[PDB]
């Protein structure tokens with residue numbers, strides 16, 4: 001039994017739906033039926049949905065149960081238990097740290113190419129639950145990738161977000177904004193601009 | 197009962213000719229009534245007998261951990277030689293065969309860009325040096341920092357991220373004191389990849 005936490009961006013963005021996943025493995029053919037009992041801080045709920053079983057290569061079934069949760073509950077540190085084996089996960093306990101957002105312009109050597117990369121460094125935050133978005137002139141970007149949180153030496157986490165845009169746009173003096181959402185932020189939001 | 201895990205050699209060991217690459221075969225969940233584990237290594241079918249097996253290791257969950265290490269050649273691993281680890285045990289119905297090799301696919305040369313600290317970060321006593329490595333394949337890579345010949349220690353590298361063009365990218369952040377950066381010292385970002393010239397690429401960064 002494995003109890004996975006909701007996606008970091010799903011617990012911050014109200015437009016998405018955070019889910020707690022309970023993956024059960026090594027299920028026997030003699031006993032395929034698996035009963036799931038979810039508990040939110042003790043109180044038993046019944047709004048969980050179970051996905052159809054999938055036979056693995058090692059002749060075992062893989063039963064997965066999904067429980068949709070609220071954004072406020074997880075952020076406040078609600079205790080979620082999965083009774084199959086009784087696993088239990090929750091929000092990362094510990095003193096929250098404010099992230100430091102730094103936007104970085106493309107390297108001079110990258111100007112030789114047709115497309116440049118915009119860098120947004122976010123460091124010194126806790127916990128690792130975070131969401132990063134890019135936007136330009138109000139309209140959001142789509143061609144960007146963000147690295148998973150990395151545990152730094154001081155106990156906090158950090159990551160990077162790379163936006164790829166045409167060199168023409170960057171040379172025309174356009175303004176790109178790096179949006180960061182985190183628990184220990186004012187209004188759970190911080191933004192930094194970047195232009196030539 | 198017992199499970200077998202075959203680990204690939206360190207990326208920097210297969211590229212640096214001074215280091216020694218080795219394929220590790222880790223066996224867990226070994227019964228106390230049968231700690232006898234047989235290892236059989238095969239290189240593209242041909243069985244080798246130069247492996248070095250370490251004695252058993254008692255774990256906290258009342259199980260043993262037998263580890264077999266096989267040193268390999270740099271040219272062999274890079275050419276895509278297939279390495280097989282046959283594990284035999286009395287508690288096993290049939291010998292378990294795990295098999296690993298170099299990640300198949302056409303190699304791509306990584307592009308290394310060093311980025312100076314932000315202006316806002318200059319307020320702090322510790323600034324961050326950024327190294328961007330993008331457009332490489334496969335994900336097997338190694339990144340290191342150095343200054344004045346001597347290597348740095350206070351840095352961290354993000355795991356490779358699959359980009360939109362099918363290639364991988366990552367970042368490496370070096371944390372130095374602002375006094376060093378303002379003194380005019382030079383910091384270099386060392387990158388080791390199989391698609392690079394002499395499997396090495398380095399870019400410098402200074403104020």
Ligand SMILES: *[C@@H]1O[C@H](CO[C@@H]2O[C@@H](C)[C@@H](O)[C@@H](O)[C@@H]2O)[C@@H](O[C@@H]2O[C@H](CO)[C@@H](O[C@@H]3O[C@H](CO[C@H]4O[C@H](CO)[C@@H](O)[C@H](O)[C@@H]4O[C@@H]4O[C@H](CO)[C@@H](O)[C@H](O)[C@H]4NC(C)=O)[C@@H](O)[C@H](O[C@H]4O[C@H](CO)[C@@H](O)[C@H](O)[C@@H]4O[C@@H]4O[C@H](CO)[C@@H](O)[C@H](O)[C@H]4NC(C)=O)[C@@H]3O)[C@H](O)[C@H]2NC(C)=O)[C@H](O)[C@H]1NC(C)=O
Nearest residue numbers: 199200201203204205206220222224225255256257259296
């Ligand atoms: C009894 O205890 C032992 C020992 O565990 C220890 O004791 C217990 C009591 C606890 O306290 C533990 O916290 C403690 O560690 C248990 O043995 C464990 O068994 C599990 C499996 O059930 C193993 O998990 C695997 O881990 C590997 C990665 O292992 C590296 O990283 C670990 C930290 O992340 C580290 O602890 C390991 O030592 C090892 O470290 C690496 O070592 C090599 C060489 O030694 C070195 O070169 C590396 O640099 C170094 N790396 C690091 C980070 O240190 C993980 O890869 C495995 O994932 C595979 O298997 C999964 C299914 O189990 C699957 O989901 C994955 O996708 C992946 O599957 C493979 O994927 C590859 C592609 O990548 C594919 O090619 C393969 O075909 C595919 N194979 C399969 C089978 O799917 C896996 O998660 C633990 O490592 C192991 N512990 C140790 C110390 O080895 C034992 O289970 C306990 N018994 C009971 C009954 O509970």
Ligand SMILES: *[C@@H]1O[C@H](CO[C@@H]2O[C@@H](C)[C@@H](O)[C@@H](O)[C@@H]2O)[C@@H](O[C@@H]2O[C@H](CO)[C@@H](O[C@@H]3O[C@H](CO[C@H]4O[C@H](CO)[C@@H](O)[C@H](O)[C@@H]4O[C@@H]4O[C@H](CO)[C@@H](O)[C@H](O)[C@H]4NC(C)=O)[C@@H](O)[C@H](O[C@H]4O[C@H](CO)[C@@H](O)[C@H](O)[C@@H]4O)[C@@H]3O)[C@H](O)[C@H]2NC(C)=O)[C@H](O)[C@H]1NC(C)=O
Nearest residue numbers: 002004005006007021023025026027056057058059060062
């Ligand atoms: C029969 O086969 C089953 C299926 O295994 C699969 O098929 C085989 C052929 C191989 O391809 C495997 O690679 C593959 O997984 C086995 O089930 C597996 O059991 C093992 C443990 O027994 C599980 O390993 C555990 O993995 C956790 C992380 O799992 C995520 O990441 C995986 C990739 O890294 C991904 O494959 C998983 O699906 C899962 O992905 C996440 O899913 C959630 C929910 O859907 C999402 O929210 C996330 O975003 C996903 N993340 C992604 C996509 O990156 C580890 O966390 C876990 O570690 C913990 O336990 C170990 C001990 O087991 C500790 O040492 C460790 O410290 C830590 O506490 C563990 O490694 C594996 O995930 C299971 N497979 C699947 C598909 O879930 C059966 O075990 C096997 N039966 C027998 C008898 O062998």
